[PDB]
Amino acid sequence: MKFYIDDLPVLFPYPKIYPEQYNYMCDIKKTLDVGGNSILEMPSGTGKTVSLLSLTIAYQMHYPEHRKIIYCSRTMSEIEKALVELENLMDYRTKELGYQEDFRGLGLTSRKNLCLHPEVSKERKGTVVDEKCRRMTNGQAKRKLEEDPEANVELCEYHENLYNIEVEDYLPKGVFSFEKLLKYCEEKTLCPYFIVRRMISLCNIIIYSYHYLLDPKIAERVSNEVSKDSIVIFDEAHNIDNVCIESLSLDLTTDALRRATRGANALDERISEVRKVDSQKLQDEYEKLVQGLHSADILTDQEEPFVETPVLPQDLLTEAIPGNIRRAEHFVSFLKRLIEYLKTRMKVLHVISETPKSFLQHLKQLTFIERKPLRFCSERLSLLVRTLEVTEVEDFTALKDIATFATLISTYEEGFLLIIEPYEIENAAVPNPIMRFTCLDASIAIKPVFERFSSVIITSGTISPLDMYPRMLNFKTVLQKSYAMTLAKKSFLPMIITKGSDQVAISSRFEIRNDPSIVRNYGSMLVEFAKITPDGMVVFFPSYLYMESIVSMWQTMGILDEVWKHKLILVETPDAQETSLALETYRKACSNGRGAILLSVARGKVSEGIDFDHQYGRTVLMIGIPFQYTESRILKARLEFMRENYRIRENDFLSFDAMRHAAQCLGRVLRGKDDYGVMVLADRRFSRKRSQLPKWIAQGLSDADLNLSTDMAISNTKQFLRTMAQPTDPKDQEGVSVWSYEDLIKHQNSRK
Amino acid sequence: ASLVASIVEARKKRTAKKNITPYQRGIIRSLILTLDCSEAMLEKDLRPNRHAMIIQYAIDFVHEFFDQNPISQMGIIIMRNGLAQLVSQVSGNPQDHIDALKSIRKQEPKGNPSLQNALEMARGLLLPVPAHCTREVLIVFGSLSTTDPGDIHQTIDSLVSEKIRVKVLGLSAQVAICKELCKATNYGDESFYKILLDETHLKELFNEAVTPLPVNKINKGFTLVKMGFPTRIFEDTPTFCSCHSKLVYGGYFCPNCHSKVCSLPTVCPCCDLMLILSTHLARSYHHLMPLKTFAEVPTTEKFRSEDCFSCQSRFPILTSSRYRCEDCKQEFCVDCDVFIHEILHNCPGCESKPV
Amino acid sequence: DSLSKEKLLTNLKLQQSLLKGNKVLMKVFQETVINAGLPPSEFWSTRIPLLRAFALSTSQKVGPYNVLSTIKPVNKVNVNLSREKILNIFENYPIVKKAYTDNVPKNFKEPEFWARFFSSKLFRKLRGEKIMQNDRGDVIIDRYLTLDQEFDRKDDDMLLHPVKKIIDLDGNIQDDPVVRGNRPDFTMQPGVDINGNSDGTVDILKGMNRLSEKMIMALKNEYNDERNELKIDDLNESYKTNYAIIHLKRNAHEKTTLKVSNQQMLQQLSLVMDNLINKLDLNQVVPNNEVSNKINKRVITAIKINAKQAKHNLEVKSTLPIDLLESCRMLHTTCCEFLKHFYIHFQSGEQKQASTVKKLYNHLKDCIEKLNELFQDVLNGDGESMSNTCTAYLKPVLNSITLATHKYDEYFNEYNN
Ligand code: SF4
Ligand SMILES: [Zn+2]
Ligand SMILES: [Zn+2]
Ligand SMILES: [Zn+2]
Ligand SMILES: [Zn+2]
C-alpha cells in the first residue's frame, strides 16, 4: 500500500496497518525534520521494524539529503531477521515500481562467522581463527609467497579472488541475506569478511552490533567509512550501560602475570635471535620511533596493530615514543620491571579500592615508570611484534592485557576506579588475589557518537521510565514520549502472585533461596502449570547456580520425575551449542505438539534477543525479583558513583534495573495483535512496581491482580483459554485496532 | 436490557450465518469415529464422567448421523493403552455401533494416546473407499500429549495425498499440532479444530458436526453412480436372508439378483449395488436447496398483518417479532420462524405466494 | 510395501493365522477349498479387505516412552514383569539388550538374571537417579559402564550435525568471541563442589536430552523454506471457500406405458350452495344394512387375508433335525459364495476369465446335482413332509442359480452363435 505522509511518498507491504505504528512513524518524521535525539517507548506487541524500514527507504530515496542510515542492533539473529524484513520490503517495492532501485545495505560480524576458508574456519576460538587468518592472509604471507614461491606461507583462495575481481564487482547491486551471500561466495569462492570490510563506505545503510560501535578496537574502524551526517537508529539498547562498562572494565589473574613473564622471556630470547641474525630491522624500528612514527604510520592498512586501541581514538597520543622505551631491549626491561611492579602489587591481603592517580603515584614512588610511557606501551609493543615477526604469539598474547590496562589507566583517571582484592574466587580453596578496573560512566563511549552524529535516534520496547537515561548518559533529547497499544481486547494477562495456593509469601532472595517450604510451594505452582500447559512455558530465576541447586534437589526428591509424563524440559546449558540444539528440539517439540519447558537467566543469553510466538510465547514465569548479586564491589562503586553524579537512588535503581531485566524477558511473548498469553509474576514485593512497569504492560495489569494467589491464577488462566479458544468478529477491530487505508484516511479527517 | 442483549446476540449469530449459500456438500460420506479410552477422560471434573457423557453423546451422534445421512457408513476406532483398537467398521447398521458403544460403556476407560497408530489404521480402513465416497474422520481428545512410534508429518502428507478432510474436537484448549492437522487436512482452514466450553456448547458442536460439509472445485469428483431401488415384498413364509441366513417373514427383493436383505440403506451383498429408498435421498434436499433467513421487520413501520401469518398468534409491540420470508414477503413470528428453519423445509407463505 | 492385493494373497502364514483364529471361515474353507476344490487364490480374493484388516491388526506397534521414569520398583521389591515391558527396555537400551544376550544362556539363569538387573548400579543410574558410589549394584553389569559410555559418544557423534542458522546460538556467541571483559559470577557457572567437580546435574540433563533426541530420531527413521515460516498471514487475505454452488432445472416427464366446463362447475357450485343453505339431515346417512352388509363383506374380505398375513406378521423354530438343518445351511451359504463369485465372473467383462466361467459353471452344475440328490435323500428319509420345508426353504437361492444358468446360456448363444 503506497500512501502519503505530509511530504513523503510512503509504501507499506501490507493492506493493513496499526495506528501506533502510524503515529510512531509520524513522530519519527518530526524528529528527522527537527534534528537531534529522541527516546520513544514502543508497544512490544506492535510490528515496528518493517514500518521503520519502509520510512527509512522512502526518506533516503526521496529526501535530497539522502543521508546514510545506521541501524544499531544487539545480536546477529536480530540482524538476520532485519535482513529478511528488508528483503521482503525491497521485493514488495520492486514489484510496486516494476523495477528495482539501486541500493546496498548489509550486516557486519566476525571472521569466525565469515571465514569461508574451510581450514581456518574449523578452529573453535575466534581469536585462533583471526590469528590464522592473519598469518595466511595478512599480506605478509602474500609478500613472502611473492618473494619466494617456496616460502610455504599460503593464501586463501577466497581472499585472492577478491583481488582477482573489483570491489564494486564483488556483488551485484541490491540486498543480500547472510545465507544468500554465503551461497554466492561459496559458488564464486569469495571471502565475505573482506568483502563486508570493503562494503562499509559503499552500502547506503548499515546494521551491526553494539560492540563494533562501542569498543574502540572495533569502533573507529567502522566509523571511518561511515558518513558524518548519517541517520542513527538503535534497537533495544536498554542494557547498553552494561556493554559500555564491560568494554572498559578489566581484571587480573596470577595466570596473567605468569603468562606475561613467560611471554616476555620468550620474546627477549627471540630478540636475541633477531639481533644475532640482523639488527637492521630493529634499528629501522628504533629510528622510526626516534622520528615518532606510530603503528598506523609504519604498518599498512591490511596488517593490523597487535595491541588494539584500549582507549578512545580521541584519547590517543600523537608525539614520539620516549627514550626510556625507545630501544627494544630497554622497552623489554622496562616491561619486565613493570611486571615486577604488578607482581609485588598483586600479593595484597585485603580489599583495596584506589584511584588511577593513587596507583600512578605509588608507581612513581616505588619504581620510575611514567604515565606517557604507559600510554605509549601499546603502540610500542604492537610495533615490536610487527618488526620482530614472532607469529607464534601463543606465549605472547597475554601482554596485550597488560598494555591494554597500562594505556587505559594512564589515560583514564576520573570516572574510573582501580579495585584490588585478595579473592579472585571468593568461594575457593586458596585465595587467588585480583586487581579490578571499573568503568563507572557509560556516556563516555556514546559521547563520540553524540558529537559525530546529530540525528541519533533512540528506541526500545520496555524502557520505563525514560528520565534516568539522560541521567546515566550525559545527553538530552529534543522530544521524548512513550506509546501504548490501542488493542481491541486484552490478550496479554498480567497478574502479580504474592502467595501460593497455601497463601505463603514468596521471594527469591539470596539468603532465603534455600528455604524448602517455599521450594515446595514453588513446585506446587510448577505442577499446576505443568498439568495445564498446552504448547510452551518458560521459568526464569535471578541466578543460574540457584537454578541448578533447586533443580538438583527437585530431581532428587522426584517431582521432576513425575512431571516428566506431561511435557519435556530444557535448561540453559553452559555451552550455547548445546543450548542451540536444545532450542531446535523445543522447536520440533512444539512443531509436533509435545512441547517443552525452558529455564534460563534473566541476565542470560536467552534473555537478550530470543523470540517466542503463538505456541512458543504462551506463558512465562518469573520467580522473585531478578536482582544482581549484592556484594559486587563494582556494583556498589557504580551505585555510589551515579548517586554522587546524577543523584540516582541506590535501591530505587536496583529495583528499576531488576524490573528492566524482567520486562525485557517478559517482552518475548507478543509480536503482533494476534498472539496472546498469561503473564505470571511470583514475588511479594512485585506489587509496588507498577510505576517501574512499562505503560502498556501495567495498562493490562489490574489493581485486583496486584495481590493474587495460585488458585484464582489457575482459574483466570482457565477462563482465558476458554475465552480465546473461540473466534472473534472482525468488525470489532476493523477500524479501531487494525486500520485499512480508508480507516487511516477517516482518522486523518477526524483529526483535521 | 435483556431483550436488547438477546437482539444483539441474535445479530452476532446472524452475522455468523449470513453466508447462506447453496454449496455442493459431502453426500456420499464415509466416516471414522476415533474415540479414546485414556486415563485423562476418567476425571470427575465432568459429572458423572467425561467418558460417561462421551458415551451418551456419541450414541446421540450415531442416531443423528444415521437419520440425517442414512446412505453414509461410519466406523469407530477406539484408542486405549498405547495402541488403538477397532470396534466398529463402516456399516449401514447402527445396531452394531450402538452395541459396541454400550460395550465400551460397560468397560472402563484407561490408557495413553497413539494418534499416529490411530491415523495409520484409519488410513487402512479408508484405503478401499471409492472416490465418490468422501473420506472424513472425527477426532476427540482429552489430553495435551501423545507419544507415537514414528513421525507424524509423513502420515500428515500421506493422508493429504489420500484426499481427506477431518474435524478435531479437543477438551481443554487449542493445541498447535491439531491446529496444523486441521489446517493441512482442510486446505488451510482451521475452523475444523474447535474446543468446547461446557456440555451445552459440546452438544451444539455435536449437532453442527452431524451436518455435511461443502466440497471444493479443485478436488473435483463429478461422476455418476449406478443406483437401484429394491422392491419390498410382504411375504407369506419365513424366508432366508442373504446376509445372516435366517428365516424372515417378509422383506425386499434385489433389483438384479432378486435376493432379500434385512435392512436399508445397504449395499447388495450379492450383485453388490447400493439399495436405498426415496426417503434417504429425500433427507438432504434441504441441504440441496437451503432456507434463507427471514427479515425481522422493525416496530417503526406499519405492518400488513398484526398477527402471525403461520401459527396465527398476535404479534407483540417493545420489539417487532414479525419475521418476513424474502421469498414470500410474509411476516412470521419468532416461534414459527425458528421451528420452520429447524424442522420444516418449505415456506407456506411461499406456497401462498403465486409464481 | 506389502500392501498390494498380490502381497495380501502372498502372505499365506498370515492367512493361516487368521483362518485358525476364525471358525466359520475354517468351515467355509474346508467346504470350498478342501471338499469342493476351490483354489485358495480366489478364496481369499473375495476377502481382500478382511485380509487387509487382519494385516493392519498384526502389523502395528506402539509409541516409545521412558520405561524407567514410569516404572518404580516398590525388602525384596515386588515386580510385575511383563515381556512387553522387557522388550520395551530392550529396544530402548541396546546396552541392556547386549547385557541380556550374553548372560541368560551362558552365565546365569533368567530369574537370577533379572534379580541382578534390578540389583545393578546401571539400573538406578540409567533410571531417573544419579548413581551413588556407595551402591554395590552388580559387578557383572559394571563391565557395561564403559561400553555404554562408548555408546554415548558414538550416539553423540551420529547425532551431531550442522545446525540451522537462524536458530543457532553459536553464531550469537561467536559473533564477537574476542571479548575480554569480566567472567560472570558463581551463579552462572555450573554446580560444582569446592574441588571443582560437578554434581552431575548437567550430565543427567544431557542424558534426558539424549533421550529426547532418540525420540526425534525414532521419528526420523525409515518409517528457501525460511521465507514461508518468516512470512506472516495475520495481515493477509483469509482463505476463501471456493466450493461450487449447484443450481437446478426441473422438468419432470409424465408417465409412459372427459373434461368438465366452467359453466358445468359453476352450475354445480350453485346447486351445492342451494343444498347447503337448504338443509342438512342427521339420520339420512345410516346405510340400509344390506349395502352396509356388502360393506361388511368387503371389509371382512380384506380382514381375513390381512389378518392371515398378520398371523405371520436367532431365527424361527424349525422342525428340521439339527444335522440336516446345518447341512442345508452350509450348502446354502457355500452356494451363495459360488453365486457371488459368479457375479464376479460375469460382471468382470473379460475374455481372460472364460475358462474360469466354464469351470465354475461345472462346479455350479455339481451344486445343482448336490441340491437335487439332497432333496431326494430328505424325501426318501422323511416322506417329503419336511423335505417340502427343505425344498421351499432352499428354493430362492436355486431360483437365482437357475437365473445365472439361463443368463450364461443366453449370452453364450448371443456371442457364440
Ligand atoms: S580471507 Fe576470509 S575465508 Fe580466507 S582465511 Fe581470511 S577470513 Fe577465512
Ligand atoms: Zn440377514
Ligand atoms: Zn443383488
Ligand atoms: Zn407463528
Ligand atoms: Zn416464504
Curated annotation (Swiss-Prot), chain A:
The gene is RAD3. Present with 14400 molecules/cell in log phase SD medium. Its cofactor is [4Fe-4S] cluster; Mg(2+). The keyword Nucleotidyltransferase does not apply. Disruption phenotype: Essential, it cannot be deleted. This is General transcription and DNA repair factor IIH helicase subunit XPD/RAD3. Keywords: 4Fe-4S, ATP-binding, DNA damage, DNA repair, DNA-binding, Helicase, Hydrolase, Iron, Iron-sulfur, Isomerase, Metal-binding, Nucleotide-binding, Nucleus, Transcription, Transcription regulation. Belongs to the helicase family. RAD3/XPD subfamily. InterPro entries: ATP-dep_Helicase_C, DinG/Rad3-like, DNA/RNA_helicase_DEAH_CS, HBB, Helic_SF1/SF2_ATP-bd_DinG/Rad3, Helicase-like_DEXD_c2, P-loop_NTPase, RAD3-like_helicase_DEAD. One of its GO terms (cellular component) is nucleus.
Swiss-Prot record, chain B:
The keyword DNA damage applies. Present with 2340 molecules/cell in log phase SD medium. A zinc finger (C4-type) spans 254-271. Component of the general transcription and DNA repair factor IIH (TFIIH) core complex, which is involved in general and transcription-coupled nucleotide excision repair (NER) of damaged DNA and, when complexed to TFIIK, in RNA transcription by RNA polymerase II. In NER, TFIIH acts by opening DNA around the lesion to allow the excision of the damaged oligonucleotide and its replacement by a new DNA fragment. In transcription, TFIIH has an essential role in transcription initiation. Belongs to the GTF2H2 family. This is General transcription and DNA repair factor IIH subunit SSL1. Residues 30-209 form the VWFA domain. The keyword Cell inner membrane does not apply. GO terms for cellular component: nucleotide-excision repair factor 3 complex; transcription factor TFIIH core complex; transcription factor TFIIH holo complex. It is found in: Nucleus. GO terms for biological process: nucleotide-excision repair; regulation of transcription by RNA polymerase II; transcription by RNA polymerase II; transcription initiation at RNA polymerase II promoter. The chain holds residues 96 to 459 of 461 of the full protein. It comes from Saccharomyces cerevisiae (strain ATCC 204508 / S288c) (Baker's yeast).
From Swiss-Prot, chain C:
Keywords: DNA damage, DNA repair, Nucleus, Phosphoprotein, Repeat, Transcription, Transcription regulation. The keyword Nucleus applies. GO terms for cellular component: cytosol; nucleotide-excision repair factor 3 complex; nucleus; transcription factor TFIIH core complex; transcription factor TFIIH holo complex. It is found in: Nucleus. GO terms for biological process: DNA repair; nucleotide-excision repair; transcription by RNA polymerase I; transcription by RNA polymerase II; transcription initiation at RNA polymerase II promoter. Belongs to the TFB1 family. This is General transcription and DNA repair factor IIH subunit TFB1. The lineage of its organism: Eukaryota, Fungi, Dikarya, Ascomycota, Saccharomycotina.
